């Protein structure tokens, strides 16, 4: 067979140990999920420094805790705008997930609170910026570099899926690089805790699985499809399906055809054909062997999964770090006031926050 006795026994033991880890991780998650933390700091504990990111969601600001001097990234949402955009449930769910999960590649919520006007999630500051910026600058990542990041996503999805969390928002724009070169996943607005199927059309066109496009009920296999898109884009410098307009992108996604750069290794192409598999009965991550079809694939043969989890692998790339509070890996944005009204807005809606 492919493995002799010693290798087979080692792999089996490793796979059983994953099960044991995940069982304990679920117990811990469920305790925090059922009794979320609330109101663990306040706005005047922090100095506002600079805007790190802005969007329809709101803003993320670099802040400094006045006592410790520790920097954090503070996501600020205007309660009235959340209501207007019909994002109450997503916003509550994002905070609930973040305060309940615990994994080395998931950003940590250090504090959260609210005031008359806004909701605040204070997360660890991840100073390396978005993978997106580094990928577009460098052009593409070597296969070992892409593999290092991919392995972290595989472990992160193995963890999330064991909690019945589908992620649904994977793309380089949503992956940050920390000071040690490891990945941090931060955005949980599209994540959903659901054991079976779900139906919402959400995500980013290039990363949508065919079954989402085709308005099917779908499951956690969409995250494994998205991993295939991510690995492809990391290694090629462009995604597998693109076009001028989303409608065209969707046609390519559902077609069952993907083409690869000539520099892709055969191992990479085989993995990607099995992740970018339109037929759900054939897609890796969705078969009887589960995540093991991915972790045991030849493209990952050099990956020491425990060493990645323990963060003992030397990262292939370390972002420039001039010091605490350095924001040079993020873009510059027009700075807007943080208005706090004298009157409480949308109190009932956000009781759980």
């Amino acid at each position: 067979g492919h493995m002799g006795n010693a290798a087979a026994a080692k792999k089996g033991s490793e796979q059983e140990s994953v099960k044991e880890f995940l069982a304990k991780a679920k117990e811990e998650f469920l305790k925090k999920w059922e009794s979320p933390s609330q109101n663990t700091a306040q706005l005047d504990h922090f100095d506002r420094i600079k805007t790190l990111g802005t969007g329809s969601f709101g803003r993320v600001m670099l802040v400094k805790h006045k006592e410790t001097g520790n920097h954090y990234a503070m996501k600020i949402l205007d309660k009235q705008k959340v209501v207007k955009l019909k994002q109450i449930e997503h916003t509550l769910n994002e905070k609930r997930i973040l305060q309940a999960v615990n994994f080395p590649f998931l950003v940590k919520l250090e504090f959260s609170f609210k005031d008359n006007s806004n909701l605040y999630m204070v997360m660890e500051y991840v100073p390396g910026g978005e993978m997106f910026s580094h990928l577009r600058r460098i052009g593409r990542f070597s296969e070992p570099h892409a593999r290092f990041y991919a392995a972290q996503i595989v472990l992160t999805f193995e963890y999330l899926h064991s909690l019945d969390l589908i992620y649904r928002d994977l793309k380089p724009e949503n992956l940050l690089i920390d000071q040690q070169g490891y990945i941090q996943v931060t955005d949980f607005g599209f994540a959903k805790r659901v054991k079976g199927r779900t139906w919402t059309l959400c995500g980013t066109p290039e990363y949508l699985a065919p079954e989402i496009i085709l308005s099917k009920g779908y499951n956690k296999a969409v995250d494994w499809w998205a991993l295939g898109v991510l690995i492809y884009e990391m290694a090629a410098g462009y995604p597998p399906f693109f076009a001028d307009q989303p409608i065209q992108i969707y046609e390519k996604i559902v077609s069952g055809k993907v083409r690869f750069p000539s520099h892709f290794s055969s191992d990479l192409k085989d993995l990607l054909r099995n992740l970018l598999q339109v037929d759900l009965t054939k897609r890796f991550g969705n078969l009887k062997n589960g995540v093991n079809d991915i972790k045991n694939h030849k493209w990952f043969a050099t990956t020491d999964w425990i060493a990645i989890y323990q963060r003992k692998v030397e990262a292939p790339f370390i972002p420039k770090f001039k010091g605490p509070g350095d924001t040079s890996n993020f873009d510059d944005y027009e700075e807007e006031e943080i208005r706090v009204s004298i009157n409480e807005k949308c109190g009932k809606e956000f009781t759980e926050f």
Binding site: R136, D169, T204, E206, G237, Y238, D244
Partner: peptide, 20 residues
């Protein structure tokens, strides 16, 4: 080339999700 096609797509910058 595929790279040139990517640049021509106009989708080389940050990509919005569907709801945005």
């Amino acid at each position: 080339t595929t790279y040139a096609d990517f640049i021509a797509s106009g989708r080389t910058g940050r990509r919005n999700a569907i709801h945005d």
